[PDB]
Structure formats: C-alpha cells, structure tokens
Amino acid sequence: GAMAPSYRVKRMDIAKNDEECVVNAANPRGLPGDGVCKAVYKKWPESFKNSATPVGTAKTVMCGTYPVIHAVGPNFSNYTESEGDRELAAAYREVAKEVTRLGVNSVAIPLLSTGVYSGGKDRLTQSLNHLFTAMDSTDADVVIYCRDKEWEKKISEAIQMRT
Ligand SMILES: CC1=NN(c2ccccc2)C(=O)C1
Numbered sequence: 570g571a572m573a574p575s576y577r578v579k580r581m582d583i584a585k586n587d588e589e590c591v592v593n594a595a596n597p598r599g600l601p602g603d604g605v606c607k608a609v610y611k612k613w614p615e616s617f618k619n620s621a622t623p624v625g626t627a628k629t630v631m632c633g634t635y636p637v638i639h640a641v642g643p644n645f646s647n648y649t650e651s652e653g654d655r656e657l658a659a660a661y662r663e664v665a666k667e668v669t670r671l672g673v674n675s676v677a678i679p680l681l682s683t684g685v686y687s688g689g690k691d692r693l694t695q696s697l698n699h700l701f702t703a704m705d706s707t708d709a710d711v712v713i714y715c716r717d718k719e720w721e722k723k724i725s726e727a728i729q730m731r732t
C-alpha cells in the first residue's frame with residue numbers, strides 16, 4: 570500500500586499518468602471506442618487482447634507488465650437512471666477488487682459514465698461518490714484524471730471537503 574493513502578486530481582491525458590496502473594473507461598466489446606478509451610487504445614493497444622467484459626465489471630489485461638483495468642460503466646442512453654446507477658456503483662467495486670488483487674501502490678482513474686455514456690447529464694458528483702465508496706477501503710494512492718477546468722475545481726473541492 571501507499572504509506573499515507575491519498576486522493577489527488579489532475580487535468581491532463583490519462584495516457585501520460587505517473588501511476589502503477591490505469592483504469593480504462595472501456596466499452597463492453599473491447600473496441601478502441603472514443604474519449605479516454607481511444608487515448609488508452611493509442612498508448613496500450615496490446616491491452617485490448619480479449620478485454621471484452623459485461624457492463625458493471627472490470628477485466629485487467631497486461632501491456633508488458635503495466636496493468637490496464639478495463640472498467641465498463643453503463644451508457645445512460647440505454648439504462649434507466651435506477652439500473653444505470655446500480656451498474657455504475659458495481660463497475661467501481663470491481664475496480665477496487667482488481668487494484669487490491671494487483672498489489673499496486675497507485676492507480677490512475679477517470680470518472681466512469683461521464684462524457685459519451687452520460688446520457689447528456691452532468692454526473693460528476695454521482696460518478697465521483699461511487700468512486701469514493703469503492704476505493705475508500707483500498708490503500709492505493711488514487712489519481713483522478715479529467716480534461717475540464719471547472720470539473721478539476723469541483724473534484725478538488727470534493728476531495729478536500731472530506732479531509
Ligand atoms: C467536462 C464534462 N462535462 N460533462 C457533462 C456532460 C453532460 C452534461 C453536463 C456535463 C461530462 O460528462 C464531462
């Protein structure tokens with residue numbers, strides 16, 4: 570574990586992370602996809618060998634020795650708010666089991682089911698709170714990646730408000 574496990578947020582491409590593993594915002598089919606998934610595909614394409622996995626699950630594939638945890642959040646265009654909420658919580662719980670299993674001291678993570686899978690709604694608080702519920706029991710350093718200046722500020726405020 571990390572000596573003093575922490576949460577941090579950075580506004581930059583998760584493909585440039587400084588952590589021991591990365592969480593992909595994957596599609597269920599293991600396709601290159603869009604947004605974070607496409608950035609992950611360019612940096613670690615070898616990790617998309619047999620990465621297909623159902624909604625609400627995570628599947629780790631090694632790129633060399635670097636673990637890529639493919640986490641499948643729901644696309645809120647297809648799910649009810651209720652069922653989508655359940656699957657989004659579940660995907661983060663599966664990320665926490667994989668981070669623990671791998672024995673990493675740090676993990677790079679995006680906010681699942683924001684952007685293209687958001688169903689046109691602001692889900693920063695919903696996705697971040699499910700991330701916290703899953704990762705709070707882990708002792709890895711968690712570095713949350715985002716691309717929007719206002720989301721960076723709101724994620725930073727949410728981390729500090731619990732400290
Ligand atoms: C920046 C981001 N804005 N959003 C977003 C999406 C729909 C409505 C409002 C906000 C994201 O998912 C990431």
Ligand SMILES: [Cl-]
Nearest residue numbers: 580581582585
């Ligand atoms: Cl960047």
Ligand SMILES: [Cl-]
Nearest residue numbers: 715716717720
């Ligand atoms: Cl963002």
